[PDB]
């Protein structure tokens, strides 16, 4: 997609984003990001030859805080982008009627099918 | 420890300059570990001049 809010160039979220709900508490994707943050802390304890799962707990909580925060803002922008994609799609649906005809859904009483019986 | 381990001839295969030899690969050499090729001597420009008599 090309903007379609190619007016404000790096408006990270307009007031258009303040009408859809934000990502809620204990959504599974932010919990996945938090587990990835704990894994980042585990491997940061692993590389520096300090004991893994020990003596770096402030760094553990730092990494978890940072990744949960960044993933929260990414989820917000993500949901705004899919919402504006959906709304522009439906605006183009409602705009032009005649290019999108209602296909006359014939029931199976008259819809013929080639069969080719398999043995 | 009874398990097979890779050895000196596998090590000789996975080394050298390039892996697969040709009829032309003999000019390639393994790189120096310093990445430095120092020795050459440039004294041909000891250029003479006859500050002469007159």
């Amino acid at each position: 997609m090309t903007g379609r809010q190619a007016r404000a160039p790096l408006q990270f979220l307009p007031d258009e984003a303040r009408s859809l709900p934000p990502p809620k508490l204990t959504d599974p994707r932010l919990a996945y990001i938090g587990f990835l943050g704990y894994c980042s802390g585990l491997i940061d304890n692993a590389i520096r030859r300090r004991p893994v799962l020990s003596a770096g707990l402030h760094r553990q909580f730092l990494y978890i805080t940072s990744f949960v925060f960044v993933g929260y803002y990414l989820l917000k922008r993500q949901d705004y982008m899919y919402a504006v994609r959906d709304h522009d799609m439906f605006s183009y649906i409602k705009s032009h009627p005649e290019d999108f005809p209602e296909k006359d859904k014939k029931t199976y009483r008259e819809v013929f099918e080639e069969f080719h019986p398999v043995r | 420890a009874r398990q097979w381990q890779p050895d000196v001839e596998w090590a000789e295969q996975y080394g050298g300059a390039v892996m697969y030899p040709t009829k032309e690969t003999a000019h390639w050499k393994p790189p120096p570990w310093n990445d430095v090729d120092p020795p050459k001597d440039t004294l041909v420009s000891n250029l003479t001049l006859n500050f002469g008599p007159q």
Partner: protein, 347 residues
């Protein structure tokens, strides 16, 4: 090489790339590419040896002739319809010259003969920073000038770049030439999708830069140039082994790891067009550029080469180098399979 002056030169590399990103005027883009060249020369020759001298020579000649060919393209563009906007061009000849100048700059298969030469003799910091920025910045310009490109040009360069970067990579027993051939293959992938949906290409740019950052960080961790040294870093440093395992399989492109989200999303928004024979050819060649990764992984961790001692001396001294940002970039590069709907973060 005073460190204040090094901070100055790195800020000028940043400045050249930002000037490329920021303008609508074509001469500012040419200024940005040139300032990028001028400051990326002395990130090389951080050592003394004349290998860096010859590498900087070859890189300077090819980079400057690509920049001059781009200036030719802009000047013929304004021989025709005269505007300084970065938009759809108004000359097929100028689009031809412009795509070939960018093909010489960021590496394509008729034009890549300087890339293992420049990456062989230089240190790893210079190689990392030139691979990241010199494969970043003209993707912005390509993203801008995409609506006026003959598709034969980009597509032929991309196919041939992937297959040459694959076929060259099998033989090298170095490391930098393996990484450079992989760079050519990924630039072929990142160019091949440009005329269809460029969000795919720019997200491939993000993922490839994260991958190359993890790679050259793990090679800054231990001064290794051959696979022999990789085996000795198996025997001296054990977590490095499994990280080389995971990141090398992620450069391979295997699905439960996060090297798959670049390729497969490209194939999705590629085969929603009527091109099927070309994605299956390209992805079989992406099967081809994985064998040198496999022999590299074999030489590191899956097999255990005999190791020279004095590691008995080295065991008292742990890995006391510096790491740029190793764990964050690592677990961002590896465990990012299920966030494929972070496709749409880009636009």
């Amino acid at each position: 090489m005073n460190p204040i002056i090094l901070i100055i030169i790195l800020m000028t590399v940043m400045l050249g790339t930002i000037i490329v990103m920021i303008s609508t005027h074509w001469l500012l883009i040419w200024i940005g590419f040139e300032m990028n060249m001028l400051a990326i020369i002395p990130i090389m020759m951080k050592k003394h040896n004349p290998r860096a001298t010859e590498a900087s020579t070859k890189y300077f000649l090819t980079q400057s002739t690509a920049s001059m060919l781009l200036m030719m393209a802009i000047i013929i563009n304004l021989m025709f319809s005269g505007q300084w906007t970065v938009m759809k061009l108004f000359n097929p000849m100028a689009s031809m010259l412009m795509t070939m100048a960018l093909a010489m700059k960021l590496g394509m298969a008729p034009f890549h003969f300087w890339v293992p030469e420049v990456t062989q003799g230089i240190p790893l910091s210079s190689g990392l920073i030139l691979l990241t920025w010199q494969k970043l910045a003209p993707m912005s310009v390509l993203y801008q000038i995409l609506p006026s490109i003959n598709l034969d040009l980009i597509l032929t360069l991309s196919i041939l770049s992937i297959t040459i970067g694959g076929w060259g990579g099998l033989n090298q027993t170095q490391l930098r030439k393996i990484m450079a051939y992989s760079s050519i293959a990924h630039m072929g992938w990142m160019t091949a999708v440009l005329l269809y949906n460029p969000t795919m290409t720019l997200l491939n740019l993000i993922i490839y830069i994260i991958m190359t950052s993890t790679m050259f960080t793990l090679f800054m961790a231990n001064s290794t140039t051959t696979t022999l040294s990789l085996s000795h870093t198996w025997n001296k440093a054990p977590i490095m082994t499994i990280l080389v395992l995971i990141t090398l399989l992620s450069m391979g492109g295997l699905p439960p790891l996060s090297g798959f989200m670049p390729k497969w999303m490209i194939i999705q928004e590629m085969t929603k067009n009527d091109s099927i024979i070309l994605p299956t050819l390209m992805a079989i060649t992406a099967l081809l550029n994985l064998y040198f990764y496999m022999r590299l992984t074999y030489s590191t961790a899956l097999t255990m080469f005999p190791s020279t001692n004095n590691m008995k001396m080295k065991w008292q001294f742990p890995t006391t180098k510096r790491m740029t940002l190793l764990p964050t970039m690592t677990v961002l590069s590896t465990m990012l399979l299920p966030l494929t709907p972070i496709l749409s973060i880009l636009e």
